[PDB]
Each structure stands twice: as structure tokens, then as C-alpha cells.
Amino acid sequence: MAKVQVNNVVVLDNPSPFYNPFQFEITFECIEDLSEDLEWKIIYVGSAESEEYDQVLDSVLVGPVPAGRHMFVFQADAPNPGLIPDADAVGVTVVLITCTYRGQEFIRVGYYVNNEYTETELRENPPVKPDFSKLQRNILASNPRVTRFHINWEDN
Amino acid sequence: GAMGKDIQLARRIRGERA
């Protein structure tokens, strides 16, 4: 008895500029009729060195809809480069899309975002300081940490 | 320090965001 079961996620923001917006073509199946708005949020771990930095790129609200399996296309402008530390910026990070209905999260696509330089030289030998402008977000679609939960979409 | 980036992220995904 869930109202939305997100199934597929065709990430478009595969390794592209860090200043390119997170593009998630999610295909979810609205299993039931909805009452409130569906809150898909993209949470970019602001520091994989400190998780409490988790930033929020955007949150799309899909209102009450009478079920239906279909795809929508997420995009969200990049995080604050100042929020990310060295080891995270030129490193591995996660950007999770927690679908949050009624303030209750019922799924989490923890897409590992591997931030590695765009320019081959910089991949050859990563500059000691993180260049978010040279940074390319490789959204590891080979490693989607999908953690979904069951929530009360109702008031029971 | 936080060298284990993976596990940091694993935290947030497993149930740390919420």
C-alpha cells in the first residue's frame, strides 16, 4: 500500500560538469491515488567528510494523481562549491533522491557522485586543491544505493 | 580523519538523511 513506487531512474547527469545541473529522468509508478504532494528531493552530500553538510539541489512536488507508471525528468542546479571539502570534491560523494511524502522519506537513490576533473591533465594528476570548475560529476549509475522505505501516505 | 568516504555516504543513504 504505497502510492508511488519509483522503478527506473535514467540519470542524464552522467559524468558532466559539476556546474551542470543534476539531471534525473526518474520513472516511477504511482501505485495509488495521491492526497498530498510528492516530494522528490536531491540531496548532495555536502561533505563526504561530514555528512551533515548534505545539500538540497531541488525538490519536485508531484501532486495528487490517480496512480500511473510514468517518467518525469528531474534537474537541479549544482551545490555550493564552498561546502565541499578537498577529500570530497575530488573524490566520491553521494547524491540521494529521497522521495518524501508527508515529510516521510520512502526512497533514497544514493547515486554515488564521483567528482573528478574534466581535463585529462587533472585526472592524470589531481591538483591538490579541488577545482569545482574543472570538476566533473560522474554519477555512478553502476552504483545506485537505492534505499526505499514504507511510509504512511495517510493519517493512520 | 574522514578517509572512508564510502562509509560516510553509506551512513547518509542507509538512514541518515532520514
Side-chain angles (χ1 to χ4, degrees):
Chain A
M1 190 200 63
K3 282 47 167 67
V4 152
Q5 204 309 270
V6 9
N7 298 272
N8 190 214
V9 55
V10 17
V11 219
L12 330 160
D13 171 37
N14 248 156
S16 310
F18 160 68
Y19 291 133
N20 138 89
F22 296 87
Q23 308 182 88
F24 286 96
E25 183 159 89
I26 297 147
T27 312
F28 71 99
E29 179 180 48
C30 190
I31 353 185
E32 319 207 315
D33 67 280
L34 236 231
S35 315
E36 195 178 82
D37 44 87
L38 233 317
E39 181 183 50
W40 308 73
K41 196 166 310 189
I42 316 176
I43 294 80
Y44 187 96
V45 160
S47 179
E49 272 191 87
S50 309
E51 23 65 272
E52 291 188 76
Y53 295 13
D54 69 289
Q55 320 140 331
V56 168
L57 291 312
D58 188 55
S59 52
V60 52
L61 317 185
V62 178
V65 301
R69 136 183 173 196
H70 67 114
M71 163 237 92
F72 83 97
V73 69
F74 223 145
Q75 301 182 31
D77 305 276
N80 287 336
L83 288 186
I84 306 186
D86 279 82
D88 192 25
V90 281
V92 311
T93 321
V94 157
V95 68
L96 38 84
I97 302 184
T98 62
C99 212
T100 311
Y101 185 89
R102 301 191 75 140
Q104 296 138 208
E105 306 193 340
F106 58 89
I107 186 180
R108 194 162 310 170
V109 85
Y111 262 108
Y112 257 70
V113 49
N114 201 267
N115 303 275
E116 285 201 322
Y117 290 118
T118 46
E119 318 198 316
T120 319
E121 175 187 297
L122 308 183
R123 310 181 58 93
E124 291 281 294
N125 62 138
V128 187
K129 280 327 103 184
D131 273 275
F132 311 92
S133 39
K134 300 286 190 167
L135 195 56
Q136 208 191 267
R137 303 191 321 243
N138 170 38
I139 285 58
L140 295 175
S142 50
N143 209 267
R145 192 59 176 133
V146 195
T147 306
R148 50 182 193 192
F149 337 80
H150 300 206
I151 66 170
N152 72 146
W153 312 64
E154 320 71 36
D155 195 272
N156 63 87
Chain B
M3 180 186 58
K5 311 299 301 321
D6 306 77
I7 189 63
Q8 286 281 147
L9 307 168
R11 292 183 181 195
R12 218 63 176 165
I13 313 171
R14 278 301 309 238
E16 206 58 72
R17 165 61 200 169

